[PDB]
Amino acid sequence: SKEYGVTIGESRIIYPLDAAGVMVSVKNTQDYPVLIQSRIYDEDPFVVTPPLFRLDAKQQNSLRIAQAGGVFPRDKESLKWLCVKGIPPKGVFVQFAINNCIKLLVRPNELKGTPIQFAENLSWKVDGGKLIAENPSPFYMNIGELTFGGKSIPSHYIPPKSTWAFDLPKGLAGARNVSWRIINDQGGLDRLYSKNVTL
Amino acid sequence: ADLTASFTATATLVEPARITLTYKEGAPITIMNGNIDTELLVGTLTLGGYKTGTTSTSVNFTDAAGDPMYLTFTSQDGNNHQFTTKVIGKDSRDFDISPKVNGENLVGDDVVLATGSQDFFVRSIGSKGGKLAKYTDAVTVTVSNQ
Amino acid sequence: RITLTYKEGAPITIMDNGNIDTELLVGTLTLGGYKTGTTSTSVNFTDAAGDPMYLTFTSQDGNNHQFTTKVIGKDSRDFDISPKVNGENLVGDDVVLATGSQDFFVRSIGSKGGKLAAGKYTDAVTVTVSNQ
């Protein structure tokens, strides 16, 4: 059978606002050469170099991500996506290509602290069949584990100074207990926080 | 004499984002009236490498046709015959789940993918045209890591 | 006065199995202020985990993910210098320390009990230097 794989050396990029650049490793984990195609998307101030290059079997290379211009809020983080695609060489035939995408988190130096210091501050409510989180911090709170009434909820980021509503499975009638972990800057599942919903 | 000192040693550990994909070709396909049989397991996809907590809605299989919810296969001959497929799987409770396909989910709620890897099956639907006579697709699997 | 400083090494990449590579330079301990002639066996690096031969680092996320490390310096001919770590030592890596100060490399062993999560890891290390 056929095998594919792209590894980025981190699962997120914390980009300090106004910084010259950052680097991230990209690894072709396959036994055939590919083309590595890298694109930035909104949730072109950020430039990826090289945007396209060959990467031989089991080889690793690095991209530079650089901010030239652009304007971002300084009271809040901004979110972009770095996408890294491994294009393989060219009755049903199908060819696949993995497009591996990670958050590019634009962080004002003007922001005090880091996410793990404010992860406890999430507050929770059920309105209209949905579990709603409120994030009073200036950081994206990248939830990586979320449970309500002891039932797993697929997670999603809560944007800065804003909210996110999660769809609930059936049977969480009068459930009040929410548990969550965010993903820290290095890509690790952080501490478990637990809290009752309010009205 | 014993003299002492102390320091807190520190280390930073990092989690790269690894995405893998295995495609296992299904049986060859049989023309019956110029229909292929439905629910033919065209192929089995195994997505792996992702972090536990990765969700079904963060996975998007796209192709050039762009038909929401369906991948489109086309003949390599010049005649442009076409059929559509869906990409579907099962959760831990054995309920029907799907990734996004051209940006939309066919079936089920957003779920957390199985730990380690998750199988998806490419299953034939039909061809809104009619008479099918190598059929090809080029599919991008985009994973938006949490 | 005995001094103990530290320099963190490169970030450690967690492998797909949740483990880490061996022999990675986690960081460098620099011991100083000891009497001339002090030998490697007069130096005992200790921590709370207390694993003989090994220093244990713990995640800072309340999840108690751990990895172990060994503490090995190098003499001028690139032979191992093994100080005592929690009372114990490798056989045959006993040596007089460099004059004034001595670098000891903290070298990775691997995960202790489960897949490791990314983040910050620490170990509060005490050194006791005998025969001063």
From Swiss-Prot, chain A:
Keyword set, alphabetical order: Chaperone, Disulfide bond, Immunoglobulin domain, Periplasm, Plasmid, Signal
Main location, first listed in the record: periplasm
Cited function: Has a stimulatory role for the envelope antigen F1 secretion. It seems to interact with the subunit polypeptide and to prevent it from digestion by a protease.
Lineage of the species this protein comes from: Bacteria, Pseudomonadati, Pseudomonadota, Gammaproteobacteria, Enterobacterales
Family: Belongs to the periplasmic pilus chaperone family.
Disulfide topology: C83-C101
Pfam family, one: PapD_C
Subcellular location: Periplasm
Entry GO terms, CC: outer membrane-bounded periplasmic space
Any one GO BP annotation for this protein: cell wall organization
Keyword Signal: yes
Source organism, top-level taxon: Bacteria
Stated name of the protein: Chaperone protein caf1M
Transmembrane segments: none
Molecular function terms from GO: protein folding chaperone
Record InterPro entries: Ig-like_fold, PapD-like_sf, Periplasmic_pilus_chap, Pili_assmbl_chap_C_dom_sf, Pili_assmbl_chaperone_bac, Pili_assmbl_chaperone_C, Pili_assmbl_chaperone_CS, Pili_assmbl_chaperone_N
From Swiss-Prot, chain B:
Keyword Iron-sulfur: no
Compartments, as annotated in UniProt: Secreted, Capsule
Cellular-component GO terms for this entry: capsule; extracellular region; pilus
A GO biological process held by the record: cell adhesion
Keywords: Capsule, Plasmid, Secreted, Signal
UniProt region (Contains potential antigenic determinants that may stimulate T-cells), positions on chain: 78-128
Disulfide bond sites: none
Protein name, per record: F1 capsule antigen
Species of the source: Yersinia pestis
Name of the gene: caf1
Part of the whole protein covered: 34 to 170 of 170
